Amino acid sequence: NTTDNIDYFDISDESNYYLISQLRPHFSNIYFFDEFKRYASYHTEIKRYEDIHKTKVNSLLNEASRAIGICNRLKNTLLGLINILENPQKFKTQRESYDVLLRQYEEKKEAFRGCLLNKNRKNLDQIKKINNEIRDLLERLKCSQDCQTNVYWDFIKIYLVDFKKMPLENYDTFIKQFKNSYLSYVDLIRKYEKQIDDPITLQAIKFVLKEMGYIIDRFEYHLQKVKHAIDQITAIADGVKPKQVTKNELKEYYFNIGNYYAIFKFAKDQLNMLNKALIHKEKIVHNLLGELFGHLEERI
């Protein structure tokens, strides 16, 4: 097999509000529930959030993983097609045309991504329910007009330190190197299709390049999302430092920095996975080009 996992497929719901990943915890919103555990431990009135987290948040997370796993049968079928399409030797030892296999790939890709969303729809509703319960729990803060913002500000300072650990410049360097090499390969295959008589090898390379393009798009999408999250929290740190605020304001403060930090934490893992997926595709492309040039040498 040329490809052993397809963790790089993701899907958003129709409202574009939630993004579902195959990587646990599957939604960045779960990391928000995790960050709120940290905020609540500094407010005596809401320390009971720890019991909400260990019951409702843990159950939601395990329900999310269960939903993802319901789609494993479609995933395995899709992996089977991918491995025929990427591998000329496997294509030559079956009898479906390359065009029929490509159409089946498109159908199974959308059925698999659709399963990831469909089986998680009730989980998305439960995110909204737990968010609402957190908003209600915050009512128990004693303050009303005079809520202190020191915990909020302290966590912004922590987040800025955490942001420095992320290889953000290296990710820019990587996706640029990779996009440029991708576009070079695409242009190169377009020339080879006229100079080299090897449609079995060329069609497989073209397919792998098509996959690489999908994964590049995902990388760029998640990279823009985490840069936006860092920029938003950085602008808070660079802006007017609050004094005391109303309880309603403090709720929104924690939801804002908790959700953007959750986006950052979730993007870390998603980008690392997509970087690995792109390196894996590079390996496959180069080995296919080895075959292409070796066949060309043989035909002189």
Author numbering: 30 to 329
What does the paper say about this structure?
Among these markers, the P. vivax reticulocyte-binding protein 2b (PvRBP2b), a member of the PvRBP family of protein adhesins, produces the top prediction for dormant P. vivax infection. PvRBP2b binds to human transferrin receptor 1 (TfR1) to mediate entry into reticulocytes. The surface of the N-terminal domain of the natural protein PvRBP2b (residues 169–470, PvRBP2b169-470) is a mostly positively charged α-helical protein comprising ten α-helices and two very short antiparallel β-sheets. We sought to design stabilized variants of PvRBP2b, under stringent conditions of minimally perturbing the solvent-accessible surfaces to maintain its antigenicity profile.
We designed six variants with the standard phylogenetic strategy (encoding 20–37 mutations from WT; designs WHT2476–WHT2481) and three with the ProteinMPNN-based PSSMs that exhibited fewer mutations (17–26; designs WHT2482, WHT2483, and WHT2484). To determine whether the designs retained the structure of the parental protein, we determined the crystal structures of WHT2483 and WHT2484 (19 and 26 mutations, respectively) to 2.4 Å and 1.9 Å resolution, respectively. The biggest divergence in the backbones occurs at the C-terminal portions of the α5 and α7 helices with up to 1.7 Å difference in position at His464 in the α7 helix in WHT2484. The main surface change is the reduction in positive charge in a patch on both WHT2483 and WHT2484 compared to the parental construct due to the introduction of the charge-swap mutation Arg418Glu. This is reflected in the overall reduction in the calculated pI from 9.2 for parent to 8.9 and 8.8 for WHT2483 and WHT2484, respectively. Comparison of the binding footprints of the human antibody panel with the mutations introduced in WHT2483 and WHT2484 reveals that the binding surfaces are largely conserved, with few of the introduced mutations being within the antibody bound surface of parental PvRBP2b169-470. There are three introduced mutations which fall within the antibody binding footprints, these are Lys248Leu and Met324Phe which are present in WHT2484, as well as Gln378Leu which is present in both WHT2483 and WHT2484. These mutations fall within the binding footprints of human mAbs 237235, 283284, and 241242, respectively. Despite the presence of these mutations, these human mAbs still bound with nanomolar affinities to the stabilized designs. Recognition may be retained for Lys248 and Met324 as the contacts are solely mediated by van der Waals interactions with the sidechains, which could either be retained by the residue swap or are long range (>5.0 Å).
